[PDB]
Amino acid sequence: KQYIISEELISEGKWVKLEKTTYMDPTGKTRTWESVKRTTRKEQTADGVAVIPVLQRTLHYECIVLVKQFRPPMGGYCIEFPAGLIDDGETPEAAALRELEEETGYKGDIAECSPAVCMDPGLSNCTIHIVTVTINGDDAENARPKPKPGDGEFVEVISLPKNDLLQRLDALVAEEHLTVDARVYSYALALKHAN
Amino acid sequence: KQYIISEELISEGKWVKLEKTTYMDPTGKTRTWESVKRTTRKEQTADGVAVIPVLQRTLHYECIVLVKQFRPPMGGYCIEFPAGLIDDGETPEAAALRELEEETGYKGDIAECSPAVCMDPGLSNCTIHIVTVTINGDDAENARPKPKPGDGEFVEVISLPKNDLLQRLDALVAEEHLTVDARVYSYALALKHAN
Ligand SMILES: Nc1ncnc2c1ncn2[C@@H]1O[C@H](COP(=O)(O)O)[C@@H](O)[C@H]1O
Ligand SMILES: Nc1ncnc2c1ncn2[C@@H]1O[C@H](COP(=O)(O)O)[C@@H](O)[C@H]1O
Ligand SMILES: [Mg+2]
Ligand SMILES: [Mg+2]
Ligand SMILES: [Mg+2]
Ligand SMILES: [Mg+2]
Ligand SMILES: [Mg+2]
Ligand SMILES: [Mg+2]
Q1: Is B66 annotated as belonging to a binding site?
Q2: Are the C-beta atoms of residues A21 and A124 closer than 8 Å to each other?
Q3: B13 to chain A nearest CA, in Å?
Q4: Measured by CB atoms within 10 angstroms of the end CB, which terminus of chain A is less buried, N or C?
């Protein structure tokens, strides 16, 4: 019972744009909101993907493979799930595997896909697909993983124990003034709650 | 090795601010990046809080209390963890318990706190504290919780079994068009991954 009335643009850019959104609340009163939008998504259900890489070895408990990388908007380094954009025509699952191999060097298999989930609904229309992927650490191809980053992408890879992911994440945030992604943290919190 | 060199304003607004950021990579080369910021930024620990509300009643499965709200930036409705901005001169924990009682009516006890985590690193600088709050559902004050929403806020409370969260979420996405918050989904995926 709430609908968007109009979207009056405010600014533009090479990657991001900002607009004013007019909408109707339940009662009928018109209200406004400042909405952020990207300029890269086209027909895809989500801007990009986020991979939950589960490293599996026969003599070890599963590791969650993450990536450390300086993020300009934060003016610092963030520990996130491998992530990327979905090219036109590319399936979320494909993009997830491609981006994982690019940012970590690991070839993996799909475990599951998810619906389009929002990154910050109270601010942007940004949605992504969280793809759970498995990686065989015992395989000879994953022996010495050589990352293959794109133009100007500099990524460090950090594998953390699924069993102790939350504690290990708290450790890295204090010593390097680092920042963990909210999704990575919510995932580690559930792992604690369940275990 | 990488740091901010300059942040050029591009646009402003009562709540949102667009910006162009110029920084240096590891090789000593300069690059840019478009970013977003909340003009309502002071000097606290984080922009706001996200509350993971676990409703606990004896002999019952635990329920994860979520909220459904129309989100202008999304042009539709989203299922999210109760959340709100921290007030000036307020602790995360206090913000968490307040924002919970205002958006769902429930009154709980702090379980654990998280360090500020980034909402969307490659687009914004917004951080939140994810606070796990337990709600004793066998107490009178939580028998019939009274939600006190702020002006123009329209929240619908939705409680789902923690033990079946991921599937009960999909049951809603299938029932009607809805977008689940990425943090909520990440959490739900891990509850299943832990075993
Ligand atoms: N807001 C932005 N400003 C400058 N470059 C961007 C922006 N958003 C995405 N990119 C580029 O897109 C790449 C995406 O990498 P990834 O999503 O981790 O596969 C980044 O490494 C940048 O080179
Ligand atoms: N980007 C925005 N555009 C218009 N109003 C906003 C925006 N961000 C926050 N607000 C206002 O701030 C309130 C914050 O609620 P909460 O997240 O519960 O603290 C919203 O209900 C809006 O009334
Ligand atoms: Mg990435
Ligand atoms: Mg990409
Ligand atoms: Mg990449
Ligand atoms: Mg809210
Ligand atoms: Mg509030
Ligand atoms: Mg509120």
Answers
A1: no
A2: no
A3: 8
A4: N
Using CA atoms, how far apart are residues A98 and A57, in angstroms rounded to an integer? 22
Angle at B189 between CA B185 and CA B193, to 5 degrees: 165
Residues in CB range of B135: below 8 A, 6 or more apart: B53, B54, B55, B56, B65, B100, B106, B107, B108, B109, B142
Separation between Cα atoms, residue B111 and residue A170, nearest integer Å: 16
- Per the CB < 8 A criterion, the answer to whether A3 and A24 are in contact is yes
Q: Any residues with Cβ below 6 Å from ligand 1, and which?
A: A 15-16, 48, 83-85, 99, 152-153; B 33-34, 122
Tokens of B37: 């910021």
CA-to-CA separations, A188 to A106, A184, A193, in angstroms, rounded: 21, 6, 9
Do residues B118 and A78 make contact, with C-beta atoms less than 8 angstroms apart? yes
**Elucidation method:** X-ray
- Please choose, from the candidates B125, B119, B10, the residue with its C-alpha nearest in 3D space to the C-alpha of residue A17: B10
Domain ranges of chain A: 1-195
The string of DSSP codes covering A131-150 is EEEEEETTSGGGSS------
> In this structure, are residues A181 and A79 in contact, taking their beta carbons and an 8 Å threshold?
yes
* Burial class (CB within 10 angstroms; exposed 0-12, middle 13-18, buried 19+) of A190: buried
Tell me which chain A residue has its CA closest to the CA of residue B28.
A152
Superfamily classification of domain A1-195: Nucleoside Triphosphate Pyrophosphohydrolase (3.90.79.10)
